Symmetry: D3
Subunit: 151 residues, 6 copies
Amino acid sequence: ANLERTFIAIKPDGVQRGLVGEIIKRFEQKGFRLVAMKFLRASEEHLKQHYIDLKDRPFFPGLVKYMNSGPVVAMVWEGLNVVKTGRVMLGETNPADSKPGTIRGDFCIQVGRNIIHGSDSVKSAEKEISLWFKPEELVDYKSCAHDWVYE
Amino acid sequence: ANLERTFIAIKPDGVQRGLVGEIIKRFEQKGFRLVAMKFLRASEEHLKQHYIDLKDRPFFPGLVKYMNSGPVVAMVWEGLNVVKTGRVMLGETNPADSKPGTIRGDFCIQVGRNIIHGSDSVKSAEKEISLWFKPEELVDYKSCAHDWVYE
Amino acid sequence: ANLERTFIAIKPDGVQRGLVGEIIKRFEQKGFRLVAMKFLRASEEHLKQHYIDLKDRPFFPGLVKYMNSGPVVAMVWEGLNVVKTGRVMLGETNPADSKPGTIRGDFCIQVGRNIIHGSDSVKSAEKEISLWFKPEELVDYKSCAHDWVYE
Amino acid sequence: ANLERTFIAIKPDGVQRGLVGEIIKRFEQKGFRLVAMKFLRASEEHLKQHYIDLKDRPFFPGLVKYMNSGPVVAMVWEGLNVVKTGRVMLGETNPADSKPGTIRGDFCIQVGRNIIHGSDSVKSAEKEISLWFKPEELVDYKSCAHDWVYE
Amino acid sequence: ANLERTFIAIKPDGVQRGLVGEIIKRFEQKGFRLVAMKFLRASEEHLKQHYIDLKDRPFFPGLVKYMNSGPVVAMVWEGLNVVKTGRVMLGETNPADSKPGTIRGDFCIQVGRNIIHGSDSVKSAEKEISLWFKPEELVDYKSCAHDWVYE
Amino acid sequence: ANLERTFIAIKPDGVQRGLVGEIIKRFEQKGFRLVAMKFLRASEEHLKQHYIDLKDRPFFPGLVKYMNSGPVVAMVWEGLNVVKTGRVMLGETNPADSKPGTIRGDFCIQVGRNIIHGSDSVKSAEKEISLWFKPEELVDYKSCAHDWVYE
Ligand SMILES: Nc1nc2c(ncn2[C@@H]2O[C@H](COP(=O)(O)OP(=O)(O)O)[C@@H](O)[C@H]2O)c(=O)[nH]1
Ligand SMILES: Nc1nc2c(ncn2[C@@H]2O[C@H](COP(=O)(O)OP(=O)(O)O)[C@@H](O)[C@H]2O)c(=O)[nH]1
Ligand SMILES: Nc1nc2c(ncn2[C@@H]2O[C@H](COP(=O)(O)OP(=O)(O)O)[C@@H](O)[C@H]2O)c(=O)[nH]1
Ligand SMILES: Nc1nc2c(ncn2[C@@H]2O[C@H](COP(=O)(O)OP(=O)(O)O)[C@@H](O)[C@H]2O)c(=O)[nH]1
Ligand SMILES: Nc1nc2c(ncn2[C@@H]2O[C@H](COP(=O)(O)OP(=O)(O)O)[C@@H](O)[C@H]2O)c(=O)[nH]1
Ligand SMILES: Nc1nc2c(ncn2[C@@H]2O[C@H](COP(=O)(O)OP(=O)(O)O)[C@@H](O)[C@H]2O)c(=O)[nH]1
Ligand SMILES: [Mg+2]
Ligand SMILES: [Mg+2]
Ligand SMILES: [Mg+2]
Ligand SMILES: [Mg+2]
Ligand SMILES: [Mg+2]
Ligand SMILES: [Mg+2]
């Protein structure tokens, strides 16, 4: 089979607060497969295109500036319902609405500093994956745990 | 009802994915007393009795064969509302509906590989404990912390 | 706003069960600022004042005795909505109603041994802070991570 | 290969202090395979035979009484060098001499309450295994990560 | 029959880097009893007294300045061999020589930002406890675990 | 020497055994700055250049094959003595001799599956960094904690 994929980015605040390993561990222990990963400071234009649907929102200027203010960890993760499940794992957009046990619930306070991004839909994921990674950067392998994670 | 007991089994996938100590720690940390524990490859006939209520469901033979495909860790835990609270701790039957912070929410993806079993009621717990353990295998002792966990 | 403060106390059961660091870590990693902290055996009088609204409840004598039965860690934490959010982190009054991922959800079982206290409102918080701490015991400094937690 | 085995027991203090899960995780994460596990109060005669080479030592009486004073978690673990590297993981007999990051180094203080036992040699391991388990209690299965742990 | 005690302070970098809980957890897990604790910005004078033995060394002014640059967590811990064992837990003065598994080994790089202080000797412990704490701030109580930590 | 760099790669066994987050956290927690990171299946030729000094060793062919058998996580880390300190953090080449608390000591068993690589010297580090990364992939930014990790 060819499993669902989602795009996950650890925002500059996640990197600056030293939560990269912690956040990656949460995806690994869940049983999702890391497909791609790189580390870069995305240009304001890259970030504008990432968040193109939000361009007319008033917080958008500060969002783009915050997102370009340090490096990000960009990832692709694979598995059954990984898009929706990735989102549940993150918590709500606002850390204030995010439950203890979620990444945002556990680790942050304010919507403007909410440490992580996950694709909100499959069609979003595929667009975001194409924008952040070259095809060659997506690694096709099989997880040793697969048959212990899936029927 | 401080002497309530429940049956908890770590399924073959739980054992194979190295989650035994992680699971046990969650019960220990909560204040529940470990009463019995053993490690075995349960026979197909034993598993058919365990899941006798499901013998007509289409997933039954698959479920049995998987349950026999590796060892399980069988346990008896005791404490106030341990049956219901144990259930909460595991999360929903389907990992897709299990909240972050729960065992299945944190660690698995698919209902057919859902890493753990807990009794669904006192009556089920009593049946399961009888099925899985000899009476001499239930250990009598007082937990150190009891007077700090209970009034 | 961001200068809100709350009073958090680790109850004698939380100290005795070795949960002081685990509790503190949860507040630190969330991004809240530790403002004040001390360790003491609170007098029965001090405890009666802390719980003055409950003076006529049936459980109040047992409550005051339990709370005097060992030392307590008293703390003040700062941040946006720290009162409300602190409560979310603790769980519900009754650990039976507290979800996995919260302090009571993870660690305790019975309402009379529920390991921790948090102020239920800003007015409660300011009363409790005045009750437990001398003004000089409240330390003003800026958190390293502040600008990565707050826009 | 017919891989080496060792006998590990978590002593009554390890059980009472809630360290069973933690300990088991350290063995699991190292890549050792759990072969056998049970939970029991070992009789004084069982304990005398286990520690027979110490019978004339002055601490022997107290050792047997303490080891009988609560249940123990009895285990057999498999792996290349598991006896010697198991000992290294435990620390030195005296926790005072055990380094941080070892089990006794992290968790205990006094030689008479040193939380765990491990076989000191291959010959001791085989003797101890034979005395603590029935042959049928030793579960034969292959670890899913075997080929990632071994050449 | 007072057990041995030591003075441990979490330095300003320790607090700023959000390691207070982690650090305390290590001492609780080991079996030491928390006797005293408070949180304060130590004055230059207090710190010159604390480090008076170093007053003529080149790094002393820099040390005293750094130690005043943020609040510190000051603690008294009790147990068998706590002064020496405490030291071993911290690591060497220079993090470069501190082993993985020690506090400085896990968390620090440079000698002037080495996150924690522990007394060097019983005589120094006694002096430091007296310098930092009033007698009434030392809490006399018996630990839950004592009989499982000590024979 | 604060700008010293080393090359760390999580080997395919580390990726498959779900240790990526765990490993990254240890580097983060220590205070080193992540400079560059990517995830790829390294070609046999690329790996032959990486290990060119071992090309005549009997294990060389199998080493290259194993290192190509799954993706690796390639990283550049910066900090004072990061090459030597990084080596200490990994353990010894042989897991069998690696101390508990080190990455290999904690997580692996056999030299042929030793989960991680780190440069052995500054000269080796510069050669490996150049081999594995494009100049533009070394990210320029300041770590928020720098002034709390360094004088
Ligand atoms: N400062 C600020 N940022 C916001 C606000 N709403 C959304 N954002 C940021 O914009 C990101 C994208 O918004 P959105 O797609 O609606 O939410 P998401 O998919 O859950 O991340 C969020 O993750 C926040 O980082 C806001 O009101 N203020
Ligand atoms: N393959 C498969 N297994 C299922 C399904 N539903 C339940 N199971 C398995 O059967 C076990 C028992 O089912 P059930 O008693 O209803 O759920 P539980 O009490 O929450 O464990 C579950 O824990 C699953 O492992 C399904 O639709 N497909
Ligand atoms: N024993 C007992 N203690 C209670 C009961 N209800 C509340 N308490 C205790 O009294 C404390 C204060 O009560 P309350 O303010 O209503 O709950 P809280 O603000 O969530 O802590 C609780 O945290 C419990 O420790 C009860 O029914 N029985
Ligand atoms: N109370 C007490 N117990 C001891 C002493 N020496 C050893 N023991 C206990 O006896 C056990 C077995 O001793 P030994 O075979 O020499 O050490 P081990 O193989 O490292 O456990 C130790 O693990 C301790 O639990 C002592 O001096 N006093
Ligand atoms: N900046 C700087 N600080 C130092 C140096 N040597 C020691 N210190 C600091 O001064 C503290 C006290 O030194 P000392 O009492 O000898 O070592 P300790 O008992 O390990 O803490 C150390 O823990 C360091 O924080 C140095 O060479 N430079
Ligand atoms: N299969 C196998 N692999 C080995 C052996 N010795 C070394 N290796 C592998 O080759 C790598 C490089 O060896 P070396 O450069 O000498 O040590 P390193 O710098 O500590 O990794 C090791 O990290 C192992 O992955 C061996 O005897 N057998
Ligand atoms: Mg969106
Ligand atoms: Mg059922
Ligand atoms: Mg109240
Ligand atoms: Mg012996
Ligand atoms: Mg000194
Ligand atoms: Mg080499």
